[PDB]
Task: inverse folding
């Protein structure tokens, strides 16, 4: 991804969650950027109690993942927009997604010298693995590899 | 009367070497022969 966010939010009535997410989204569109994926997660129990705008500590919070394509200039604006919203407890930001840690160290990349387009195409989920991932995806990966490489040109040279 | 003949040495020395040497004058396919043919089931292509 170009940018990503993890947004720890207060667990409110659904109409409010939807309004808040519409506000963040519109704040991203106005600033001339895109949303790769807005992923929803449940109301979880974190390891740290968060206080909201009421200064009332919270045991539970709704987690929400943002993945954005912006300019680095106007994500300052979106940053202090998101962090200043009352329904967001915490937001952590990943800017490292284009050059993550495991590449371009003493010619680790075979047949290319730092191809940037490898990790840009990808989403955050495949750059940073989630805990549930097991050896099983090693299977799926390749059925999604081989299959892809079969249909790509034929699909592209159609139009 | 017979005798041991000294075999004049081959260029490549093994058949595997034969294939590989032959293979540089050729174009590899992107996909191996067993998966080129489309599956009998249908795989909807998603993003990775």
Result:
């Amino acid at each position: 991804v170009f940018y990503s966010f993890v947004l720890v939010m207060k667990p409110r009535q659904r109409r409010f969650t939807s309004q808040a997410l519409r506000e963040i989204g519109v704040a991203v569109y106005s600033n001339g950027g895109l949303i790769r994926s807005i992923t929803n997660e449940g109301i979880m129990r974190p390891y740290s109690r968060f206080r909201d705008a009421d200064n009332t500590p919270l045991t539970y919070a709704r987690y929400i993942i943002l993945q954005l394509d912006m300019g680095e200039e106007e994500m300052g604006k979106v940053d202090k927009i998101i962090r200043e919203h009352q329904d967001v407890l915490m937001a952590l930001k990943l800017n490292n997604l284009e050059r993550p840690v495991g590449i371009r160290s003493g010619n680790k990349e075979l047949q290319a010298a730092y191809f940037p387009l490898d990790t840009f195409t990808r989403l955050e989920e495949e750059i940073n693995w989630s805990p549930q991932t097991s050896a099983d995806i090693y299977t799926q990966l390749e059925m999604n590899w081989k299959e892809f490489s079969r249909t790509r040109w034929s699909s592209f040279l159609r139009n | 009367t017979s005798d041991e003949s000294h075999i004049t040495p081959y260029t490549l020395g093994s058949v595997a070497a034969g294939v590989q040497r032959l293979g540089e004058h050729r174009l590899r396919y992107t996909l191996s022969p067993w998966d080129i043919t489309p599956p009998e089931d249908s795989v909807v292509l998603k993003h990775t």
